[model samples]
Target: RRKKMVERVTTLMDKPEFIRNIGIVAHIDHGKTTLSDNLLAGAGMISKELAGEQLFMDFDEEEQKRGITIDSANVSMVHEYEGKEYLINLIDTPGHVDFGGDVTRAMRAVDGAVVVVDAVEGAMPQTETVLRQALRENVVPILFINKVDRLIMELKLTPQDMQIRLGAVIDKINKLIKGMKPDSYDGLRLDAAVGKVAFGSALNNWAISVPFMKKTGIGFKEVIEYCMEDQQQKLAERCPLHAVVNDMVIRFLPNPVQAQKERIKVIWHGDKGSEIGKSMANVDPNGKVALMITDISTDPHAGEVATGRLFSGTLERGKEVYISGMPNPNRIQQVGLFMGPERIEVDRITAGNIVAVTGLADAIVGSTASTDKAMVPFESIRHVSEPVVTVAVEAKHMKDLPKLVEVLRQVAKEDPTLKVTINQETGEHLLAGMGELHLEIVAHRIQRDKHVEITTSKPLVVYRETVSAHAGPVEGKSPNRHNRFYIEIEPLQPAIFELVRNGEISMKQQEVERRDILMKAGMSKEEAKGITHISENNIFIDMTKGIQYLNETMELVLEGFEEVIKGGPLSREPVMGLKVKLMDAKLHEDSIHRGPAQVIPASRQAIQAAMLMAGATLLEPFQKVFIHVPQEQMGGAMREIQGRRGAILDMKTEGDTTIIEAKAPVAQLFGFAGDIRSATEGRAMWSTEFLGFEPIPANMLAETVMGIRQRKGLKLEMPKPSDFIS
Candidate 1:
């Protein structure tokens, strides 16, 4: 059976019409991985008894310990449908908001998504996030109403009421689908009546879909009756969960050919009339090879394993390929297909299939690989959230330092969401991530997977620096007095920032389109045309008067601007939502005198001076918390949240639970876990996601700034505007 399954999957690779590349995505503890296990069991990859408990895709020890998925796991399963075998490439992604970047990247490797929702919890915050991510990447979504047993055993709802609850969840998901997709996506919207939605208890290994109801004459009423009568095991035997899910996928989900025809238009940012575009859109096996690497991991013996989907052409061992951005060409050492945690070696894989390849050690997540030397790199994968928490870590012994650094590098390579920075001057190694749990998982991996002992500082909330008001064209004199720059700084309009944040407008956009977008977002025509650089939420424009030798030093000035924005002058926090315009400059006549050393400092000083004069302020990250608690524990949970400077945004009751929506500054959320548990007597359940940055409260601004500066061992007093004027 195993050999036939493998052979079936391999044979289906040549037939794009018989392939389904899909992902299982949802909110934390919503049973995405558990659902994946049942599907895997049906494919004969594992035994049915060990399905849910095994968590076959969650290979990491830390993930198993925490009972949450940290990394996205890919597996190819063979399912027989209508007397024909189809290849189903499945990716099980992390459901926590902290590992949301994984879900965002995983979407790029799949053509369809199975959005799992809890029957009792309905739609939650992370559900909305993953749905938006899937829609943004043009991945078609189908709904899976999981844990239906909760309605029968836990909630004890009547058949009529269970129908109402199920309807509410379906409507919530359909509403998100409509809101996220364009009018054309109406056909892809999920509907229970149309069989695009399925109801199941992944833990119980049973499910029911519209077709199943029609075929077996067993609907929600019959399922509830069976559950109440202690015959759920019989339901599992009669209506297998995998049969319902795989059947829905085969009937509703588009095959690779149909998916690529539309998905290529959404994902690829190139000429539609070009050869490469046609090849990808058609999933042509003989066209120029275009592959987008979405995930990378290091194997102790095999070295770097790169996993990605082939949009065009065939990939085989010993084939020569060019990683779009890498410096040198690489030869494929091997080609394989993913089987849960393992990559089963294969001779060749064709377009519309996800493959694992070796010999691209330098290739990182989001990198592209192609057979053509002149092919442009694929568009970068956009992450839904930025790293909002950081921790300084160091090896316990001097001899272990090098290994620590090497392991950290590997860790960062595996998870692009984690940012690692080494402060050469201070000898501090910092790891920044989406949230506290994200960093905790990293720490565990370093100690367990890499086998390194280390000490880490308390987690810190990542902050940003931005101007509160307009100020400057202040002068900055170079150290040698050979160059000077006059710059102005101001708060960027929220509309302009929003456009950039959502990736609606970017530097990669065509000049005309970029200009039009900027103007539409309230920038003046000239300023829009003058945009020379944009990074993160900051913009740099060259508005200088025509000056001799200015053109030659422009590159140096932009480099300096990049450096300044990375760490602002105040508190050294990264800057955001600010625009800098270089209004004037003076350069030495001789090229030797106007070198990088002279130009860089002048640009840096100008930005620093302008920021100080513009009333620079620190912005701290806030998290939106969703807590579900018993009615009696509502007041205690609310008090705990409020004590942490959180404000209740909304509150609603469902059954015996009270759901509270609130927001709190990350700085005040250090011990929130223990405090909430203590207050609610451990009966409350909650989740938090980064809610963007907000200005620090006036009462705590000065003290907080001073504390951060002191921690960094900076001067006790803040720098004055005049400090950079010279």
Candidate 2:
């Protein structure tokens, strides 16, 4: 069956006009992979028994245990409609939010998107995000309402009521499409009667729609037995999911010949009238080899497999190519296509088809492979989201650091979302990914297979050092007894901090503009123009009243503030929001008595004393939390908050449900997800966001500072006010 299937698609590979490139997109737990399996089985790639459970697309070990797909998988098949055989390349994209790496390149390869919407859940949270990308990628889209069995079995809706709910979902989908599409583009709306939409349970391996019934002689009456698993296979054969969905795929989506013209102009920046340009535009198989690798896969025993769409030219064994800007040439060892877990080696693959080849040594996702070395590279791609959570992945032993470096680089190449900052000299490699689960998956893979001893640090949080109180006229004297400097400090006003931190006003600003800008933000004219020094989020003012020797030691005072703010006196973290004023400076009559050594220390000690004499605190983050819970679960929500060190800003009853507006510390939110779920009987909806800085109160201030100090190898402790006395 495998051999025959290969031959079938191989014959259609030459027919670019009769081929379709598409992807299946949906939200979490929507069974996109199961739907993909049904299509393969219907086209005779797999068996009837394993169609839904096969999960042929999720070929990784972590996917099976985690019950989610973390990477996009590809498969090709042949579907004949009206005696015309057409080759279809289907990309099943993972739906989880953390797996954004699966999203970008898949959209580049697919010209059409079959967006699946779960009937039970109705509209998807990923709907706006998915549709925006489809339109932005210049890809046409259609709809598939999946998991209809849930209407009867799970939700207990009557047949009439099911229509009301299903129709509402279909209605909401088209309106969203209308809002997203350009005014120039029309007729993209979906209607099941017109064969642009399909509704079925891919789990049962059967599908039904208005146009599907006309060909199969099957209708809604036979769908009544959907709840019974006995006749599901019977219904599958009668309705035949491939004929319903595949026909829409072949009929609605354009072939490579149609997709490349519009897509190339939008994707590439090079001259279109040039030689390589016209080749990619027309998708000429005899022209220069042009390919864009959507993603790559790795095998332990086997080598790396680079998979991409052939925009132009034919790829064969021993073909030498340049991957984007790489100066070295990479030769293709084997050319093939993906059949789920396995790759079928073909002698050659033509343009307008998904190509899998080994031995493109340095190629990665988004790499443009071309025959001409000087072919201009394609434009950069975009991901759904950026890496928010990060950890420093270090070698357990110093000996394994080199191995850890190469292995981390390889894993990051396979997944563009997992960013690795390898510090070879320092031996601290940081891995930034979507979240904890994403980082954990790659970390586990290293120990289980790569054989590297690793220790990952806490997902690092950015904290700022600052003072909460105001202190004035602290006197600091130099060890040489030659210079004395008086200083004062207070939390910089909110207006000044905002202007300084946002780059609105800086030391580089013109004198006239800078002083007026400061005064506009409620700074006095005398204090505003005295902006002698500016560091990150902090400023130093020269408030001296024409002191005779102040000008000679001016550089020393500015130097002192720079050193202090870079890492504050407390915990050695960068300090922000200190309006330090050099009230007065006394210098020795002789130059030898007041040199850099004597003056710099006097200035530094003066600022440090003023900061400590008042009060110093660390700014920890707070997440503004929002939740919607029914009255019965209010106890669970309230109890969870009590332990989270959270405070409620507002609570109001909206009919039978309660809306909670609260703020919680970032470090205290670790276990809230699972804890809230269990307390609410497996249902709760909540979100949190950064709510600026909350000074770690004096009660826990010492502990927080010591904890941060111990996080480093050489534990640091804040110095006493008298420690600088010599």
Candidate 3:
């Protein structure tokens, strides 16, 4: 028998308790993990003293050894004030810039965030970056004046001087927030008082919002007095620091349920009529729940632990579920909740809950889970950015290959930030991430956790390849008696690419949705349907009603087309946004004679030949960077960007500070943080987000193409049309 549950919102949450699910995001050492500890400690999850210590969620020995949170970790605790409990769901995202995409996904799951800033440093590049990303997802953001301890100890400023510096810092945070969310915030600034700002020493587990400070008879002078005097005991006793911070939360943060409803609609991108859409939109209990596997873990005895925030309905233990998007049907053996490192078995879990459910071991991250029912696709959570940096990995010995592959799969499953690709020709394992530390930690895990030693090269970004113009009427025939595929090529619309780029359209949205979108984009009904049909396999096949026998053979032609894109016939680079029209196709009378094996390879050669002839060009990822470096460093930072071939879009100042925002190619920004740090003597900070694609610099194109070919051991010479087609 099942426990009867009422269809109503739980009173466990206070409607106006100042509750919000906020992520503390920044580039590394910007105080995200430290802030999480204070929040958790204030809620009594950990002792106040231990909160100051590092590796709180660096729970794993490997993480402790490396000193960074490799994956996003969520913790729940309640903040109480005035006799009411406010639920604060905290997701501490990895801030190493390369793993910034995790920060992007966190924005979707959260309603508001505490944008932590280094008090001494003000805003770095990613400070504006993470803020803009949240605003784009419509997540509200408040400013946290963190690392006050650093200011007190390192800068050693007088109380009066500290106030001016801290005030400047808050202004910088507000300035970035205003630029990103001008409508909601009404262009807030740093010196803005009370509810808009919370100043604190996260490492000390003490926060002082204006309201709390005023009530405690403390002012900026009092902060200085306490810092100078031995009043640690009095400070701890007199000031209810957590209360002050929680109070500001009540006044500012949005109610989780209400705020989340709007975000769910955007993220789901489906109608109420569809199964997943209805469940997510209406929070239906009986409806099937569709959960995208955001992270996964393996337990020796309990099997695979799949963790995801439910986008729809509820999931229960002992229920037979289906992973519709997967290659096979998966039965859920158990559903469990995360209690730190331990798994607590639970009978049922509901929507709006981030849970670790056991039993679907084969389910990869980005897969969906449902109660054997078809559901609508949710909008893809856009990545903060792609791997602008990468590293090549090799086993220490021959015996380590299988173990390395197993470990790499688990790593990719847990964090989308880390991508592992194996080049068949060179037998090289390429692992990519946001930076050096990102790769180091991942490599260490493979060595210690999986007990396999692997050697790696410095990280590099994997770029996309595309054509500038149409390439077509290229005929390809299989070695078989009768299998042929003719394809055409053209560029896709800019808007469509934007949809794909920012994740307005997730990979999950089926052919039907794409049809509607394309049709709205001025495509004919037939053309719209055609776009959707081939898009699923990610191939563009247009037989155009003009070719005979093409209609019957279109399916085979598309299958071949998709296979080639997933792993191209030649360079293995993913084909991006180029149109492939199946101008004509021929079939063998015998069914076995004309399937994927035959048609795919033939179509691959044909398309490759056409693309090469049409002047295939490499498109490296580009980033739109935003930074709030101090006025002194603005000129130097701009000069550095210019030196890297980046273009500055605009520069402005708020209060006594200056801001710099620009867009540049990802290639030009490889390891830019170290460069910027050297320029500003560690005072400057920055963030880079993939703006989109652009033409490779004309002068660099030849060497870039040749370098890639030479590295892959392909002929150093440019391939002629005759090479692709015989």
Candidate 4:
């Protein structure tokens, strides 16, 4: 019967005019998964009463254990509206600030979003973030006020008061819509009276919209009575959460053809007049194959499964496709569609549908694919969530070291948000995650999935190394003394460093544009023209006067600068907010004399020597935090943060809740979740995101440097110029 349902959904998917590719986004505890699973049940995939209990979308073992979503999942189901079957592709997105990039990535594959706001919580910081992303991507959005029963049962509000509260939520949502770039589809507005906003409790498996209420003659009083009397099952039977939400989608959301017409312009930068572009804008399956690969996962036996959306043409099984920037095309071994945790095999997935194609091994997240290599790739995704906290991971048992290494590699591949740095020589592996919670889950997954018992260090802030002053024309020789190089190290101007850090100025921009931007940022002409590479907040410039072997040796110089930036001379932390200029160089005449072994380390030593003379410091990463605590508990929360050297930026009180905004160093937040719970009696709701890096306090700078060096197995003292001078 399930297989029959798959075939029937495939039948509906054949028509782009009735397809809806949408995603659900909300705060972590706001019943998103519950609502999503109810839809699965309504699709006849499971029992009605069984939906909220199963949480089928939280299929991963870790998700089940945590009971929260930290990763995005996908499912496709069919619903009938207006006597016609409509296929709905649903993306489940993570709402935690640690997973901010999750919504952004999933939003790329969706054309519409169901912004789920809690009825009582109304709106949250995380909800605002998700909506911003939706609007940023030009994804049309509607509102779903989940956990309405909370108002009826928890708050014990009368029907009239409940309606008033609901009206406030509706008002806030309308204001949000009005505020999110008013230029987009100006008609995009939500009104419960207009049936654009939904209200209900997913836990009870019942939802109501103005239109659904009109059809069933079920009003707020009836809803209040059903939950007040603890008899929600009958309400679920008559007014299902799945049906009402799907009905709203079918009524308001645009079909694939309509969405692609507007969305293609935002997502794809190619000429719309071109054949492939035209085909994509028209969502024509017979045109050219255009796929934007949003995610990549491994199947253990099936190699890599690439999840994406087909903007144009049919993706047939066994068709050779070009993965963007890959040298050779790979054949699609299978084409499937997601059904909760399962990938249902389909012979072909048409345009405007969410697709899963296997056999593209080299594909990375955000890759574009087509029959032709010349097809313009989708706009590169700018990741919003960067890894702010790092932890060193090692096997508990020496015998499992190799297995642990492989597992970490696999983990990094599955989630790009987790940055893994493995030092092959030291046998040390470091994972930079979003926060302590993020690393904790990763640590558990490694042990659970691969059966490797790994030990992780206490979370550490990944600091940056930079100099405070200019020092230079320092000279150093290679190991064989075959090549000698002159180098200077200096702090980058604040504006230039920011532009480089934010990626506003990079190699991707044209030479002239970069030169102009850099000049405007107060760089010298030679400094602006000589940019060879920008690593993090650091830049390497070539200011030599047509020196010998410089052209051929440029790559080696870049190779050395890359190494130094990765592990700076002071404390071995990564370097940033600096610039290196090649003052002069004297290279050996013999080509073999100035190879990588010679030029690389030679350049490295000279730069390090210059940095030591220039005076280096560590930059600490900080988190901008928002904490919502009770009025009486505000004092406890404020003390908890102040004790960690945190500064209170602003504070505002809303009704009985006190919203405390502050900036805290990531280092001081190591065990914050537990500490904050005790501090606030566990009633505090809060979130923290990486703000940026700043120099470590001068008083504690040396002690911090010594600690990092000792922990890293480096010399306890900072490097001296004489160490590299000779």
Worst 10 residues of 4 by lDDT: 48-57
lDDT ranking, high to low: 1, 4, 2, 3
> Candidate 2 clashing pairs?
none
Q: Report the number of the highest-lDDT candidate.
A: 1
lDDT of 2 by residue, 490-555 (tens): 988999887775445655445887899899999999999898887767888989889887887789
Q: After superposition, how far is residue 591 of candidate 4 from its true place, in Å?
A: 7.3
Clashes (backbone N, CA, C under 3 Å), per candidate, total 0, 0, 18, 0
Where is model 3 poorest over a 10-residue stretch in terms of lDDT? 1-10
- The residue pairs found clashing in candidate 4 are none
Task: Evaluate model 1: give its TM-score.
Answer: 0.94
Superposed by TM-score, candidate 1 places the C-alpha of residue 359 at a distance from the truth, in angstroms, of 0.7
Candidate 4 per-residue lDDT, tens place, 345-376, comes to 78888888899888887788889889888887
Give the residue spans of candidate 4 off by over 4 A: 47-65, 99-101, 158-160, 173-193, 211-218, 229-231, 261-276, 286-288, 339-341, 374-376, 379-381, 423-427, 466-561, 576-616, 680-685, 720-726
**How does residue 408 of candidate 1 score in lDDT?**
84
- Candidate 1 residue spans exceeding 4 A from truth: 46-65, 182-185, 261-266, 339-341, 423-427, 544-552
TM-score for each candidate, following the candidate numbering: 0.94, 0.69, 0.80, 0.84
Q: Pick by TM-score: which candidate is best? A: 1
Q: TM-score winner between 1 and 3, please give it.
A: 1
Model 3 per-residue lDDT tens digits across residues 12-41: 322323445667787567788877766666
Reference-based lDDT, residue 675, model 1: 88
